[PDB]
Amino acid sequence: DIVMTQSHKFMSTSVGDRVSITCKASQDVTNDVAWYQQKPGQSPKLLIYSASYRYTGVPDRFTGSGSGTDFIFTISSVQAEDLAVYYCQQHYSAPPTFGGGTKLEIKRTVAAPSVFIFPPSDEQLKSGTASVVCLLNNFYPREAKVQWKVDNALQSGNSQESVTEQDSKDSTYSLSSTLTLSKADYEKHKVYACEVTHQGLSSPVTKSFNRGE
C-alpha cells in the first residue's frame, strides 16, 4: 500500500499568517490526492480534491498544490477558527491511504489565567467525598501548573487536571484541577488552596478558602 507521510505532527501560526503543510507519497500518485480538515468532535471535511482544486463551498484562503510525490496544503491568511487537524489522502491505488495528520495550532500573546476555586458541594459532602475544583480560565500558552495545599501542606497523588482545546475565537485554553479527598480528611483541615504558575504570572497566584465558609 502507498504510504502518505506528513512529517510534521504539529504546526503553529498566527492569525493573518500564511501556513503550508506538506505530504509526501511513497510512490507517484499523479494528482490523486485529497485534503481534509477535522475539528474536535466533528467529522472530517473535504477541502481540496485532485491535488489542487478547491471543493464546493470551501473558502478562498485554502489551496493545494503538487503532483507526483510532493503535495502542499496552504492557508493564505489563517483565521482563528482554522485550528484543526489536516490530513492528506491518496486514491491513485487501492486501498486509499491517509497521511498521519498535522495539527494546526494558533500562536498569540501571553494571557494570564483567571483563577477561581470551588469548595465541595453539600450534596457531595453527604456521600462521604469532598472534591475541590480550581478553574484556570482563558490563558495562553497552555503550560499552566497547579499545586494544591491543604493547611499549607503540598498535596500529591490526589488531584487530576483537564485542559480544553484551543478556543476557536481567542485561541486561549482553560484548565480544571480537581482535588479528591475523603470527607473525614476534608473535615480535619482549615485552609484549601490552589496555587497557579504561568508565564503570564510574575508570582504564583493562590486562591483559597476555609472549610465551612
Binding site: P44, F118, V163
Partner: protein, 220 residues
Amino acid sequence: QVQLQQSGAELARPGASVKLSCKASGYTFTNYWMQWVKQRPGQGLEWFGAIYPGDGDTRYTQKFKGKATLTADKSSSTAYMQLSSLASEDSAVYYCARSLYLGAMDYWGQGTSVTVSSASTKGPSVFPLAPSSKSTSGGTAALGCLVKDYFPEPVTVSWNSGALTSGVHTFPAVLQSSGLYSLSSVVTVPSSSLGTQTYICNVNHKPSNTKVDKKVEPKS
C-alpha cells in the same frame, strides 16, 4: 441534500460482534462507493474498507479483512459494517463516507463510537459548583457542574437546555485509576444575572440512562 445518517453508540464485550449502519439519502446509492474510516481515540484516520453497492465489490485494508464484513442493502440505500471478535484495539469512532469509486470523500456521516469493554455501565453523580464572591471577577461569575464517576464515555452536558452556550467550557473527561471517568463543565455569566436567571446543567449519560438537570444555586 446528500445525507449519511449513522447508528448510535455501541458498548460491546470483548469477543462479541456489532453491526453498524449508515443510511444514505439524496443521491443514487449505486453510483458511489460507501467506505468506512476508523479513528481510535486521540489518533489519526485509518481507511478501513469500502463497498460498491452497484456491483457488490468490496475492498478492505488488509489488517481489517479478518474481522470485518461490509454489506449494503440497495432497496433501503443502507450500508453496514460488522465487526466481529471485538478487542480493545477496535474501540474507535467509525465514519461512513461517500466517494466516487477510489476518489475523494465528499460527504461524511457523523460517526459511530464503538467501546469494547467488559466493565458494567455506571451513571454519574452530578454536583453543583456554585457561584460566589470567590468565582467572581469584575462583573462576571463562574459556576459549573462536576460530573463524577461514570462509565463508559460519553456524557453530554448542556446549560439551560442548550439556550446557554457563550462562555461554556466543558472539559475533557479524565480516566481515573478506578476505571471510571469524571469531568466538569463551567460557564461564566454576568454577576447581575445570578438572582433572576436560573442556571441548570443538563447531564445525559446514555449507556446508563442517567438524565440529571442540576440547578446551581448562587451563594450570598
